[PDB]
């Protein structure tokens, strides 16, 4: 009956930068923080920590943004059956997270869903980021679903994409969820990204989508950890917006 | 040994503004947030709802970013041994969770000086806030000591004091904590204000304050929590900045639109 959208929390390459593992990688490549905000520790990547580069943690700020909203869920009796993520490694953290705030990290397993990346033509460099396979997620203690079948593979995404292919791909996405949902839980969530809120939802809503321009200013709109509703309503596959079951999140910077 | 000034977390009036009052009470008084950042509950004070006016709490991230730094305290392996704070709320709140961080909410008991108040210039009108008395913090879950004689009580503070007036009794207080301190301790926690970083120590270490004008520009630039550290050269009683024990912390705001629709 609800599908709750959100955005993954704060981004370590968007607090310390884009030469961020500058700050917290020697050159032996010994993991050494400078900052309160960064982890304890970051798992190990298959690929080496060079993988980090272009699919960056959240921080330990990005971890209680999360948490809070989780919490929120949980004091406002708002159960989730089903939930899903991009397969950047901020959208698993984010969701593993918002579990732990609803006490069902031990319980809901999270589908990792490579069709609901963002906009391939975001991607800040030559190739498509080397995410972090499920299998190697679930061993980094990420409450992730091993032996989910995604919708669209990994290698079925294109780099550099165009704006009316990443519109499509999100619709269809939905509409595959919601349809292996459909007779197994009520209530759907999906960790990703801004544009996800906007993308996932406009033609489920059954509104016109937008240029590419009217898009990007939209998806500016959404703060991290930015949570919208939908309702189904009876059948039709049009979904119409709610007021969230929980209240927002808003903080400022450390400042000075 | 080593003497540590920082300044309070994320304020409830800086975030929500100045009438946030007006957002989470109803006119029964009643708290009814309505954002993540606010706290699930707030102290309840003598004069109602409105004492919070000149005398904000800190927000849900205001208590983490206090707790990461006592967290870090602990990690480092830096034993607070006495702990002082300003009477703002937003200093005890600050001082607390430090002390949760530290595991040390039950052993230290904070120590609430007036001396400590940033410069009164900083009050609107010609009375001071409506600080919660030591007696009522810790009665309000905060871990302060009621037993503690403050060195400039809140009678002793001047409305609209002069620069140099609040440079001296930062420089005064510090030196009376420092000689109280003397025999029982090695480390002290100053839990403050942004402008109580170099007013603090300035003097302390023999360097001359900033004309008001530039230590103004100074003050902004200190975010919360934002830390400093200095250590004393045995028993001479000088004292020199040095690298804090604990790292930085920065964050972010949450960003987007403030307010949609």
Redesign the interface.
Same mark, same amino acid.
Request: a positive charge; charged letters at 10%; glycine letters at 12%.
């Given at each position: 009956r609800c599908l709750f959208v959100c955005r993954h929390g704060?981004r370590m390459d @968007?607090?310390?930068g884009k030469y961020w593992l500058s700050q917290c990688f020697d050159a032996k490549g010994r993991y050494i923080?400078? *900052? !309160? *905000?960064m982890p304890h520790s970051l798992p190990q990547r298959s690929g080496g920590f060079r993988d980090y580069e272009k699919d960056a943690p959240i921080? @330990?700020?990005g971890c209680?943004?999360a948490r809070?909203?989780g919490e %929120?869920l949980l004091e406002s009796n708002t159960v989730i059956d089903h939930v899903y993520c991009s397969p950047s490694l901020r959208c698993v953290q984010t969701a593993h997270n918002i579990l732990k705030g609803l006490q069902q990290d031990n319980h809901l397993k999270i589908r990792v869903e490579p069709g609901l990346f963002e906009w391939t033509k975001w991607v800040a460099g030559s190739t498509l980021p080397a995410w972090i396979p499920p299998s190697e997620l679930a061993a980094a203690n990420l409450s992730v679903d091993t032996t989910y079948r995604p919708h669209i593979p990994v290698s079925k995404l294109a780099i550099s994409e165009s704006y009316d292919t990443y519109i499509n791909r999100s619709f269809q996405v939905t509409k595959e969820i919601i349809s292996e949902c459909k007779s197994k839980g009520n209530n759907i969530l999906i960790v990703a990204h %801004?544009s996800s809120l906007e993308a996932c939802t406009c033609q489920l809503q059954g509104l016109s989508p937008q240029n590419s321009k009217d898009f990007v200013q939209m998806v500016?709109? +959404?703060?991290? !950890? =930015?949570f919208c509703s939908c309702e189904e309503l009876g059948e039709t596959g049009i979904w119409q917006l709610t007021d969230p079951p +929980? !209240?927002? !999140?808003?903080? =400022?910077?450390? #400042? #000075?």
């Open positions: 704060e @968007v607090v310390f923080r400078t *900052n !309160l *905000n921080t @330990v700020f209680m943004q809070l909203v %929120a %801004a500016r709109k +959404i703060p991290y !950890l =930015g +929980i !209240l927002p !999140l808003t903080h =400022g910077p450390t #400042g #000075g």
